Design a binder for this molecule. Structure first.
Ligand SMILES: [Zn+2]
Ligand SMILES: [Zn+2]
Ligand SMILES: [Zn+2]
Lengths: 47, 49, 263, 113, 66, 137, 45
RNA sequence: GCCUGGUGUCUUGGGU
């Protein structure tokens, strides 16, 4: 997949506007390591 | 691990048999183990660390 | 039937007596003003340069605590409810700060008055860091010495105190009732004589002492609740009391809606 | 690391109803109302109001665990009245009292302005 | 480290009163009276100003690392 | 039984919050006349038995830069050792401790008494009081 | 290539790893990496 | 295109 480890911004949801990095991109549901709190979240690709 | 699974719970030093009793899991937020207060006595447990 | 008698008033605190209501309503009003009255507060800090002696999130943490003018916040949407792509003019205020010390001597103190509003939902009066006067520099953020620079971009968002205490419009809420303990809701601790050892309420002269003969009225209920609402300047005191009532109404309204729709 | 999101206190998940009514068939005319994403703030307000109505024979609530923002209320009424209807009446009374209360504060406020 | 923005216990803003407090001490006022003039009446707010220790003046002396 | 309730709003305004700092040190070792380890971003094609974590936060000098957030098992110092008798080296890199996270704060680069390259990476994070943390009068 | 900073005189310069580890200006042997190009965000909580 | 290895022996300081 061509978007792992590239920096990302979230445009919908409660985490809208936050920076992150794609930690794991298995399918449809991504794992973004958010920068702002020390947590890695599951998130849909539309976001 | 899910609700009502039995697990064996234990505090060292295991001086007698009620140092190891089976409890039912309830999954909860935050990172401590929670005990109902009336079991602190057989474990000789308290919450000072 | 509820009655109000305002004992004192000024911009940032209202002292008032509340009467002919239930205890639970006075308490729910107290809680709502602390916890659920929306305000505006910094919630995202983009640090492009920070060569000061303070750590990055330390400075960011102080920024979140700066009270912002939140007067027109009711027409503003929550970020989580907006239909747009990333942020925009309808769900956030953008603030900017830039300080620097030129010269090999002395210290440049960075104050909250250097926060410059850059955009915002015009022409609503929201987003300026609150000031007492016009010559008041405000809240100390950092201190700089020769060649140290601080250049940050802050995103302010609408929120409520349930999520984080920086969004609370109140500070303390003083609250008391029945200064002579006629209802007997407390049983006083004493060494020798309970009346001499316990100080008087500051509202002792607003109600009359129990007569020495008087029997206990087991039907009397609490009925007069004196409270003082102090604010931080993010909202005026009269707005907080009004919006507390308003917010509490929609919550009850929302419950009422759900019952007539579940059938 | 295991702290839950603080916004979960008031934001309702899409598959979770704000309000759920079930019967308590063990006694006649009794319902259990589960309130999601609410506090003592709402609950205590409704509870006292309801208790002063003549046709409410039992009202109580508990917040079962402070780490979860919910509570459950139990409401039993006598045979004539339907509990769910009585709850609507309690709601409208308080909305009215607060509307009145907001009005009387505004009037008194301008005089001190 | 540097004066807190808010009182921990009640939330009243105290981060704008630190400069005013040091100036009052030069004029010879006693600590209790200085706090009184600033209208910090509850003792939760008073602890914040009375017991803060200003270490940032010491950290700035270490000649900048750029 | 000796626990205590803390006011969550006090924590929000900064009560008992603290900084935490951890430093990692590494240096190049000598195994022969011209056989030395080398700081670099190791290419997967030329180095065997690579770690499972991400290498994408290293710059070209083999060192991570200040300001980048790191999580557990991320590589922050890339170093290789050649295999004795291409495709000749073995990874000898240092990952962040698995239970930690934070921001890289400062990276020292220098040489030691023996003249080989020498680095230190200090990481900072902030610890916020929570259920289970310990306090005492 | 990579920005550095002199621990004594604060001159900025680059090095492509094979250069010796010193400051061009004063010869100081303690140097520091400059901060990342990327933007850093914090939640101010 | 599945598998996937990072040390030991001490000493010292601590927790209940
Ligand atoms: Zn918007
Ligand atoms: Zn205080
Ligand atoms: Zn130099």
């Amino acid at each position: 997949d061509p978007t792992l480890n590239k920096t990302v911004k979230i445009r919908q949801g409660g985490y809208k506007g936050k920076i992150g990095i794609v930690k794991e991109a298995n399918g449809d549901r991504f794992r973004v390591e958010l920068h702002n709190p020390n947590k890695t979240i599951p998130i849909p690709c539309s976001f | 691990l899910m609700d009502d699974d039995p697990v064996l719970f234990n505090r060292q030093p295991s001086l007698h048999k009620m140092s190891m009793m089976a409890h039912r899991v309830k999954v909860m937020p935050y990172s401590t183990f929670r005990l109902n207060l009336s079991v602190t006595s057989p474990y000789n447990a308290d919450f000072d660390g | 039937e509820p009655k109000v008698n305002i004992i004192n008033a000024q911009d940032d605190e209202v002292e008032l007596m509340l009467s002919d209501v239930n205890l639970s309503l006075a308490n729910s009003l107290r809680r709502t003003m602390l916890a659920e009255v929306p305000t505006l507060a910094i919630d995202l800090v983009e640090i492009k340069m920070n060569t000061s002696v303070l750590a990055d999130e330390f400075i960011s943490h102080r920024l979140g605590l700066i009270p912002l003018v939140s007067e027109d916040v009711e027409e503003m949407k929550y970020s989580r409810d907006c239909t747009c792509e990333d942020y925009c003019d309808e769900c956030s205020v953008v603030l900017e700060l830039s300080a620097r010390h030129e010269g090999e001597e002395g210290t440049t103190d960075v104050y909250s008055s250097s926060l410059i509003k850059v955009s915002g939902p015009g022409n609503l009066n929201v987003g300026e860091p609150v000031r007492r006067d016009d010559y008041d520099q405000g809240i100390l953020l950092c201190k700089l010495r020769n060649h140290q620079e601080l250049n940050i971009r802050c995103i302010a968002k609408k929120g409520i105190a349930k999520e984080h205490a920086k969004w609370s419009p109140c500070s303390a809420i003083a609250f008391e009732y029945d200064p002579h303990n006629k209802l007997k809701h407390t049983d006083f601790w004493f060494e020798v004589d309970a009346k001499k050892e316990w100080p008087d309420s500051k509202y002792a002269t607003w109600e009359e002492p129990p007569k020495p003969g008087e029997v206990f009225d087991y039907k009397a209920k609490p009925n007069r609740f004196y409270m003082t609402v102090e604010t931080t300047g993010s909202l005026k005191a009269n707005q907080v009391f009004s919006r507390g009532i308003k917010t509490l109404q929609e919550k009850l309204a929302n419950v009422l809606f759900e019952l007539e729709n579940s059938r | 690391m295991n702290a839950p999101d603080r916004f979960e206190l008031f934001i309702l998940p899409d598959d979770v109803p704000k309000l759920k009514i079930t019967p308590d068939s063990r006694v006649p005319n009794c319902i259990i109302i589960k309130f999601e994403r609410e506090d003592h703030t709402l609950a205590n307000l409704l509870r006292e109001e309801l208790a002063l109505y003549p046709d409410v024979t039992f009202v109580a609530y508990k917040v079962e665990h402070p780490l979860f923002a919910n509570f459950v209320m139990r409401l039993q009424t006598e045979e004539g009245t339907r509990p769910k209807q009585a709850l609507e009446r309690a709601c409208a009374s308080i909305i009215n009292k607060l509307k009145t209360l907001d009005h009387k504060f505004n009037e008194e406020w301008n005089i001190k302005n | 480290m540097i004066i807190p923005v808010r009182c921990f216990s009640c939330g009243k803003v105290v981060g704008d009163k630190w400069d005013a407090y040091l100036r009052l001490l030069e004029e010879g006022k006693q600590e209790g009276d200085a706090l009184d003039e600033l209208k910090l009446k509850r003792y939760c707010c008073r602890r914040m100003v009375l017991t803060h220790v200003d270490l940032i003046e010491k950290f700035l002396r270490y000649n900048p690392l750029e | 039984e000796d626990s205590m309730i803390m006011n969550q709003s006090s924590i929000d305004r900064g009560l008992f919050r603290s900084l935490f700092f951890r430093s990692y040190m590494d240096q190049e070792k000598r195994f022969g006349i011209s056989i030395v380890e080398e700081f670099e971003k190791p290419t997967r094609a030329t180095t065997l038995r690579l770690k499972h974590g991400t290498y994408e936060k290293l710059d070209e000098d083999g060192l991570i830069a200040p300001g980048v957030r790191v999580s557990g098992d991320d590589i922050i110092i890339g170093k290789t050792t050649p295999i004795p008798p291409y495709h000749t080296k073995r990874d000898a890199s240092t990952p962040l401790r698995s239970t930690e996270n934070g921001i890289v704060d400062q990276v020292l680069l220098t040489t030691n008494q023996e003249g080989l390259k020498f680095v230190k990476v200090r990481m900072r994070t902030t610890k916020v009081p929570q259920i289970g943390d310990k306090f005492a009068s | 290539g990579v920005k550095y900073t002199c621990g004594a005189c604060a001159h900025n310069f680059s090095l492509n790893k094979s250069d010796p580890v010193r400051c061009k200006e004063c010869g100081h042997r303690v140097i520091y990496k400059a901060r990342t190009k990327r933007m850093i965000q914090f939640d101010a909580r």
